[PDB]
């Protein structure tokens, strides 16, 4: 058969990932421009929301050194790839868990709908990548919204999960933080209620 060059192997980000990718978190001075957790400026079209979560290990303990990367369409279901701090909305963001509480936060807008390769609409979702010491290769997941039951029930992706109980692991719970629309998306890496992780 045909073999291409092999991809460079992954390695864990380790516990100090923050010094390279979350300066403030590492407790070091930041540079002029940093990629952080504010995807949208107040003046951005769409329904402004707050996302928050906690990460758990197989023992039910908080993973306080986690690093997350998000990818999402804008309110119009469009991916804005030209990253710029001047933008009112950026499709890409970064966040991490507090060494204290162990909770991450993100300020964005609820994504619009996008079609899969076969033209079928996928429910509004956020693409997440998780990194941490103990994780050799980062973990892929999706965050869906509980108030999108209808769309959710029809998602070509959610429907690839054999066991329905498993799909529930990808649904964020609508809440309010300081009377502001929020969604809670906890990730369980291992064990009871373990979150579905994808390969693509």
């Amino acid at each position: 058969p045909i073999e291409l060059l092999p991809e460079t192997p992954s390695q864990t980000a380790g516990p100090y990932v923050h010094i390279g990718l979350a300066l403030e978190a590492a407790g070091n001075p930041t540079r002029d421009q940093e990629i952080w957790n504010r995807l949208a400026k107040p003046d951005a079209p769409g329904e402004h929301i707050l996302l928050l979560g906690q990460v758990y290990d197989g023992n039910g303990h908080l993973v306080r050194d986690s690093f997350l990367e998000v990818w999402q369409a804008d309110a119009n279901g469009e991916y804005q790839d030209a990253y710029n701090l001047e933008n009112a909305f950026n499709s890409f963001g970064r966040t991490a868990t507090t060494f204290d509480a162990g909770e991450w936060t993100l300020h964005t807008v609820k994504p619009g709908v996008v079609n899969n390769a076969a033209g079928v609409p996928m429910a509004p979702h956020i693409n997440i990548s998780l990194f941490a010491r103990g994780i050799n290769i980062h973990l892929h997941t999706r965050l869906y919204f509980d108030d999108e039951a209808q769309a959710n029930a029809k998602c070509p992706v959610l429907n690839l999960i054999e066991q329905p109980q498993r799909r529930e692991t990808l649904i964020a719970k609508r809440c309010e933080v300081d009377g502001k629309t929020a969604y809670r998306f906890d990730i369980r890496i291992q064990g009871e209620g373990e979150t579905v992780f994808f390969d693509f």
Binding site: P6, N28, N115, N136, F198, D199
Partner: protein, 233 residues
């Protein structure tokens, strides 16, 4: 906006380290027990951020100046980013972090007894050029002990983060130095089952790229998943 016009070569999960690699203790409790669910590539996965417009500082890539001079082995770390087909990956984001010459990181959580270097931070970033080349200027990091087995030591390494053209290609890895006797003893390096895969992580001494009477150089090329156009889809 971004468009779904590409497909990425499927990852070889037997090439990369597995999730559960018991000798690396923390992996025990931090690895899923359920199998990953495979999904078809869509715009969601085949697109990603372009960093062309991020405002980089003049010494973003120069660890000798970006934080007096740091104490340690002055070296240049350079190489090229290509895909599996051998095509260059232009204007891509390369980020790196490391410890000082004594193996001490500039991070709250680092309590190793080797002191911090007053003229060293340990962070760099560089956007690749038209030919997929990047370069950094820094000091060679020292190895460092860690609580794994009773006498575990990380070989000297630089942490790397590469964006590539999509979230599908994004990667985090570590660079090791040619000849480091600690390499073959590392549980983390050992997370990788193929010795051939290990070799790919080793930067080679590059005398041709060195600055005489100044600094040495290491060559480190990175290969990202192959990008191809869709066909008969």
């Amino acid at each position: 906006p971004a468009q779904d016009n590409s497909r990425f070569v499927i990852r070889d999960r037997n090439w990369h380290p597995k999730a559960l690699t018991p000798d690396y203790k923390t992996s025990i409790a931090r690895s899923p027990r359920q199998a990953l669910v495979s999904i078809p590539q869509s715009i969601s996965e085949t697109t990603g951020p372009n960093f062309s417009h991020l405002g980089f500082g003049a010494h973003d890539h120069d660890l000798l100046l970006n934080f007096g001079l740091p104490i340690g082995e002055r070296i240049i770390v350079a190489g090229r980013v290509v895909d599996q087909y051998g095509k260059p990956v232009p204007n891509t984001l390369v980020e790196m972090w490391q410890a000082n010459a004594g193996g001490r990181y500039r991070h709250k959580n680092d309590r190793y007894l080797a002191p911090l270097d007053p003229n060293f931070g340990g962070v760099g970033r560089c956007l690749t050029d038209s030919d997929g080349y990047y370069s950094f200027r820094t000091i060679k990091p020292g190895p460092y002990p860690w609580r794994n087995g009773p006498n575990d030591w990380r070989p000297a390494h630089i942490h790397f983060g590469i964006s590539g053209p999509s979230i599908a290609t994004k990667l985090i890895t570590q660079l090791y130095f040619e000849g480091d006797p600690l390499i073959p003893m590392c549980p983390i390096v050992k997370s990788i089952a193929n010795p051939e895969a290990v070799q790919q992580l080793i930067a080679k001494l590059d005398m041709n790229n060195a600055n005489p009477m100044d600094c040495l150089a290491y060559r480190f090329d990175i290969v990202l998943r192959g990008q191809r156009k869709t066909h008969f889809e």
